Amino acid sequence: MKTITLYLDPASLPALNQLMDFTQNNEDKTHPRIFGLSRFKIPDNIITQYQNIHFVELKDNRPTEALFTILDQYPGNIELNIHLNIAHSVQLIRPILAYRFKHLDRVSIQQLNLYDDGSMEYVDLEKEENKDISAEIKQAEKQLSHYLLTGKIKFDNPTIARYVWQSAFPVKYHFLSTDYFEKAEFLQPLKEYLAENYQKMDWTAYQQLTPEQQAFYLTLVGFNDEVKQSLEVQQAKFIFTGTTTWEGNTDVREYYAQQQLNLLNHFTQAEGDLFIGDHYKIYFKGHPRGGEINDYILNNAKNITNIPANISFEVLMMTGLLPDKVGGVASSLYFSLPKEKISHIIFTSNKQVKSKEDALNNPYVKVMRRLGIIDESQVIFWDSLKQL
Ligand SMILES: Nc1ccn([C@@H]2O[C@H](COP(=O)(O)O)[C@@H](O)[C@H]2O)c(=O)n1
Missing domain, CATH: 3.40.50.11120 (Sialyltransferase, N-terminal GT-B Rossman nucleotide-binding domain)
Known part of the structure; x- marks a missing residue:
């Protein structure tokens, strides 16, 4: 047979x-x-x-x-x-x-x-x-x-x-x-x-x-050598998880891009609430449907490395190329990240989430806090983060 x-x-x-x-x-x-x-x-x-x-x-x-x-x-x-x-x-x-x-x-x-x-x-x-x-x-x-x-x-x-x-x-x-x-x-x-x-x-x-098969696999999953190169730097690496829009009381998409740069700055600047350290190399991982919002963030963020929005976090984990820290806008992607790599998860406004308490009752966040993956203090409602 x-x-x-x-x-x-x-x-x-x-x-x-x-x-x-x-x-x-x-x-x-x-x-x-x-x-x-x-x-x-x-x-x-x-x-x-x-x-x-x-x-x-x-x-x-x-x-x-x-x-x-x-x-x-x-x-x-x-x-x-x-x-x-x-x-x-x-x-x-x-x-x-x-x-x-x-x-x-x-x-x-x-x-x-x-x-x-x-x-x-x-x-x-x-x-x-x-x-x-x-x-x-x-x-x-x-x-x-x-x-x-x-x-x-x-x-x-x-x-x-x-x-x-x-x-x-x-x-x-x-x-x-x-x-x-x-x-x-x-x-x-x-x-x-x-x-x-x-x-x-x-x-x-x-x-x-084998290195041949490794190169093969990178080809299969659309993960080019230049992105790979960027992610092998012998330095602490932080990756910001981008998003599209939320309930910001405006449909001007550039406002959502701007706000996301403010959110980034809370990790990258000493003034930010969630400052990760000066020693971190900064990456941006755009939402796959981010579109021209990803274009805006890239064009207006200083000394960041873009990781193409079609590259998933799962591929970073499969390839052993996951950063030292991940932080930024909430996504179900966080559920599968190693506990020691999660910095802060920021929930934006929508119908279900209008506060930190709402964000702590997110169905995947519930699974996470139950497993000890994250502390409540790691879950941030976006409004508590000041304009920098
Ligand atoms: N910055 C981001 C945000 C989401 N994503 C991915 O895009 C998909 C859609 O995410 P959401 O369901 O959170 O909108 C998820 O499966 C997640 O893996 C990503 O790869 N990078």
Whole structure:
């Protein structure tokens, strides 16, 4: 039987891990590979190095039916080595289990590798507190059992269903926070249930790659040598997390850019409330949708290094190139940063957040403070920061 490897993810972190797995196996030029990574465009001059390499789009967290037309090209007994986003695993595997069910004679699942989307899985599991988690697991197993007949896609508990894959397939989970599963008491029946099928997400695989594969991976994730160069400076590094706009009582976007430079100055200037030290090299990490606001900040900030807004923090962590300190406007990205690297997280105004107390009740901030990742004093409501 032929193994076909499937790499599926609508988001970023699983994809970045799956592109790592491909890099690790990149000497194999003809292994059947199907890439459904919505956010990553593999360059042609990588693709043409390979054969039996295929691409499928995702629509609504599911590969399209063009997936079947690819799999049809492989008429043998085939087993599927599948890589998935955890939060979206059910929808992603839907069309795959359909192809399986439609060809039970010859198609089997070799194994699953599942990676956190991010803060989402953990914000989701918090909502499950006060449920009988043992009971929820068993029901979801029961429903999965009836489902690789497709007599199911009605999970009573969509969140817990993400974690019963072992009842049917060999699986490995890669968790952003194993500390959460081990320390959330309500999740003890799930922790124990999962036994040896989970591990902490590795951030170090890049370190064990060859320099050739390291360069390969940087190409896969669109991380050029000049940005890399900037981030290897033998000096303390601070990275400011930029944003778009908020409720500033104006729709003049330049005002939001200006304000963000004020926020930056609170880290970089001795007068600022959150001054990090004179010895820090300053970087700006713009929001991906920041647009011309990122252009404004760049053009009006002195002695800063821009890190292209399409470069994610997850890629900085995958590559071992995360700064000494991260600070600035709140984003879910902070949930996955090492505790010792978080300086101050600044929440701007919106419908939900109109104060520091509001910001301390942010769903990912709740997970964070529970895990001891941050202190309340690290959470700043933007209005308490004076005009410099
Ligand atoms: N400065 C920033 C702000 C957000 N981001 C990323 O962009 C995405 C959108 O962030 P928000 O949901 O906070 O608007 C997040 O997934 C986060 O990883 C970033 O890479 N740099």
